Design a protein around this ligand. Structure first.
Ligand SMILES: O[C@@H]1[C@@H](O)[C@H](O[C@@H]2CO[C@@H](O[C@@H]3CO[C@@H](O[C@@H]4CO[C@@H](O)[C@H](O)[C@H]4O)[C@H](O)[C@H]3O)[C@H](O)[C@H]2O)OC[C@H]1O
Ligand SMILES: *[C@@H]1O[C@H](CO)[C@@H](O[C@@H]2O[C@H](CO)[C@@H](O)[C@H](O)[C@H]2NC(C)=O)[C@H](O)[C@H]1NC(C)=O
Ligand SMILES: *[C@H]1O[C@H](CO)[C@@H](O)[C@H](O)[C@@H]1O
Length: 221
């Protein structure tokens, strides 16, 4: 169990809950056909009306912690219990307004992931743990400026030998990409991008040799 609940943009911490729709619970989403797979559900109200300005090319940190409160001191399961092996992923979708309530029917492109590295037997989740819940990635330099949602996700595959089983821990940040260029990548639907036959979603982690995280290939300029 883990929750993405704060952002840092080019080394500046925005504050707990700022520009993120923070779920009230650290309970996972498990239904990949639910609209809950888009940006989670049950947000702490009132939801932030901050939209973080981020230059295209800028470095973002999405902060995960064990609970929706963020950092509350030492905890052996903060940011997650590292027995929960799996990937970490980040997607963007262009939106008319990053504070709009309706997140359905958006087109999501993947900008970062960290899956499994066979030679070191290390998962993205292990690195997230080592990094104190910091999922650090760059916003592609060539993107069209404007408002976007930033969907960042930690998947636990501990119970993923069947479907349902995989546990999806995700939130959406609210950003305004500045500068940039004119690229508007092709995206995928949520729900829809993840299916019950995807071997990134149904897998035995005690039988992993190679692993491919679910969803489309990472977009890069
Ligand atoms: O079908 C029903 C489900 O939808 C429901 O789940 C709840 C759906 O409403 C959620 O609250 C939302 C949170 O998002 C707000 O949107 C904006 C977020 O950005 C802000 O900057 C802006 O001001 C907000 O407008 C939206 O206003 C608010 O309603 C709630 O958290 C979910 O639990 O459950 C019942 C199902 O039957
Ligand atoms: C995770 O991210 C935070 C940024 O939110 C890092 O904290 C900052 O570290 C820099 C340089 O190391 C300092 O200038 C800031 O004063 C720190 N801010 C804090 C502690 O709130 C933090 O080091 C990262 N954690 C890990 C384990 O990498
Ligand atoms: C944002 O910051 C990181 C270093 O903190 C860089 O690695 C990245 O290229 C971007 O400048």
């Amino acid at each position: 169990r883990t929750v993405f609940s704060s952002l840092t943009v080019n080394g500046v911490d925005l504050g707990q809950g700022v520009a993120v729709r923070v779920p009230s619970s650290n309970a996972p989403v498990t239904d990949i056909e639910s609209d809950d797979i888009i940006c989670n559900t049950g947000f702490i109200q009132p939801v932030s009306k901050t939209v973080a300005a981020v230059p295209a090319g800028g470095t973002v940190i999405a902060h995960f912690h064990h609970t929706s409160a963020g950092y509350v001191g030492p905890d052996p399961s903060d940011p997650l219990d590292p027995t929960n092996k799996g990937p970490v992923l980040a997607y963007l979708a262009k939106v008319p307004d990053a504070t709009q309530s309706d997140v359905t029917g958006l087109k999501w492109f993947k900008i970062w992931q960290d899956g499994y590295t066979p030679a070191t037997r290390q998962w993205g989740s292990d690195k997230l743990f080592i990094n104190g819940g910091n999922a650090t990635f760059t916003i592609p330099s060539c993107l069209q400026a404007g408002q976007y949602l930033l969907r960042v996700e930690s998947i636990s595959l501990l119970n993923a030998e069947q479907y349902p089983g995989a546990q999806f821990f995700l939130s959406c940040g609210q950003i305004n990409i500045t500068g940039g260029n004119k690229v508007q990548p092709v995206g995928v639907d949520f729900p829809g991008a993840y299916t019950s036959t995807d071997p990134g979603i149904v897998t035995d982690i005690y039988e992993v040799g190679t692993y491919t995280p679910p969803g489309p290939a990472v977009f890069s300029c």
